[PDB]
Amino acid sequence: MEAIPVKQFVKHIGELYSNNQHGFSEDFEEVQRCTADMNITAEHSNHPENKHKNRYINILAYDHSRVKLRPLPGSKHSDYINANYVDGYNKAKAYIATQGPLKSTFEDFWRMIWEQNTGIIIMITNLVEKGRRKCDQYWPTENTEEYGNIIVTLKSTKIHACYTVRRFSIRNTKVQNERVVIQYHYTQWPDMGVPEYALPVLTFVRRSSAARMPETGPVLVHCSAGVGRTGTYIVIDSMLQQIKDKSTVNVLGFLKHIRTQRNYLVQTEEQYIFIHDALLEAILGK
Ligand SMILES: CNCCNCC(=O)Nc1cccc(C#Cc2ccc(C(=O)O)c(SCc3ccc(Cl)c(Cl)c3)c2)c1
């Protein structure tokens, strides 16, 4: 569970894939239980005033790492958002891992972006997938929309084969004060089966990560629950940064660490194997 050299990592992937992928299963079972005895509380998440603010009853925001909204003129639970700070490579609180916002949380979502000085949104979901509602549209289709004291204008849209880039101009009405928020939206979701090819995800991760300018707030990352694909993106991004910097990889170690920050980050064994596949392709992209 120490940083493994890229060469050894490649050999370690082989060990994990053998014997009907049992090594991957053991690794993922180890991730699933790592915080079981830590008694990590999520009191604010379970408070009755905040229940309608959670997309899934069981997908909570740990107290110690939750993003707190700056108190709002009045309420006692106006500080709550189902969002957590998550570390990145050599950068504590490099991300805000959050659920896909609800119509009832659009204002909180945009206020958090404003208050956190977030300049990048990573959306790793379609609004609807396999006929199920995954996320609500928190942005205007065209032109301007107001979300509480936050005025949001769509400035531009650039559609690529696997992802869309939307630039927004945001401004707080009741208060620099006019800012650019760039949304990187991954759109390629296989209607049957599972991904498939890591190359488009690798390009999405690299281009969305390179867009992080100094000295801005954390990059907001969301999918539906804000755990599965969110954690997947966070592990890939951090690991590509470790590979470039030190030519080492620590998937298990870094994942077990981020599991203390938000529950269920990298939610399935499939996502866990996907990280390894994506990282192998990046290492090979030489
Ligand atoms: C005993 N059970 C295992 C046996 N079968 C072996 C097996 O599954 N291999 C295997 C081998 C290689 C990859 C996979 C996978 C996967 C997968 C499934 C569902 C989802 C999903 O959409 O949730 C995703 S997310 C992908 C993504 C998209 C965009 C971005 Cl931006 C990001 Cl970051 C991440 C990934 C599975």
Side-chain angles (χ1 to χ4, degrees), residues 17 21 124 186 189 194-195 201 204 229 232-233 236 269-271 273-274 277:
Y17 264 117
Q21 290 138 59
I124 322 162
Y186 200 86
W189 302 104
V194 288
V201 176
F204 177 74
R229 293 152 182 185
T232 301
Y233 177 89
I236 300 167
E269 192 188 336
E270 293 61 51
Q271 288 160 356
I273 310 159
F274 178 78
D277 178 52

Side-chain angles (χ1 to χ4, degrees), residues 44-67 69-74 77-97:
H44 297 83
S45 266
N46 294 300
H47 197 285
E49 308 274 281
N50 298 319
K51 281 173 185 171
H52 70 98
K53 306 186 183 172
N54 297 327
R55 187 168 281 274
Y56 307 98
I57 11 84
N58 61 310
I59 308 300
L60 316 165
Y62 294 152
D63 295 315
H64 82 98
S65 58
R66 70 181 189 102
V67 191
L69 289 164
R70 301 207 246 274
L72 224 50
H77 300 285
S78 70
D79 78 341
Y80 185 79
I81 188 155
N82 194 316
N84 294 97
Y85 291 119
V86 179
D87 298 346
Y89 181 65
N90 285 346
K91 188 184 190 283
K93 311 188 182 178
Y95 316 96
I96 292 171

Side-chain angles (χ1 to χ4, degrees), residues 24-67 69-74 77-182:
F24 277 124
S25 303
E26 286 154 22
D27 269 31
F28 194 69
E29 243 302 295
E30 199 184 299
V31 167
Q32 289 281 76
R33 307 169 326 239
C34 78
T35 59
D37 301 319
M38 294 184 185
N39 198 9
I40 324 179
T41 66
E43 310 285 81
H44 297 83
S45 266
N46 294 300
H47 197 285
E49 308 274 281
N50 298 319
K51 281 173 185 171
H52 70 98
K53 306 186 183 172
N54 297 327
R55 187 168 281 274
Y56 307 98
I57 11 84
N58 61 310
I59 308 300
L60 316 165
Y62 294 152
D63 295 315
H64 82 98
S65 58
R66 70 181 189 102
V67 191
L69 289 164
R70 301 207 246 274
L72 224 50
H77 300 285
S78 70
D79 78 341
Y80 185 79
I81 188 155
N82 194 316
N84 294 97
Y85 291 119
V86 179
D87 298 346
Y89 181 65
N90 285 346
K91 188 184 190 283
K93 311 188 182 178
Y95 316 96
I96 292 171
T98 193
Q99 64 182 28
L102 302 152
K103 288 170 177 187
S104 72
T105 68
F106 287 172
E107 294 191 12
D108 294 338
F109 180 88
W110 284 107
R111 191 152 71 84
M112 177 178 70
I113 288 166
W114 182 267
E115 294 175 2
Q116 300 300 308
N117 188 47
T118 289
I120 311 290
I121 298 164
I122 310 301
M123 177 168 180
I124 322 162
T125 194
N126 274 348
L127 299 168
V128 176
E129 293 181 16
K130 307 182 163 80
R132 305 124 169 184
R133 184 111 229 142
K134 305 319 279 159
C135 185
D136 289 309
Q137 192 178 316
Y138 55 89
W139 75 91
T141 305
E142 50 168 45
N143 305 127
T144 304
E145 186 70 273
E146 305 174 71
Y147 306 95
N149 311 319
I150 319 296
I151 267 199
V152 178
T153 299
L154 177 61
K155 297 303 278 199
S156 95
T157 303
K158 305 299 169 157
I159 298 163
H160 307 256
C162 297
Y163 73 97
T164 301
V165 183
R166 291 186 192 93
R167 297 177 99 262
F168 299 100
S169 184
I170 84 161
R171 178 172 66 81
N172 196 324
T173 59
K174 337 263 143 53
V175 181
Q176 249 289 301
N177 227 278
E178 192 154 81
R179 50 185 91 147
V180 178
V181 179
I182 305 162

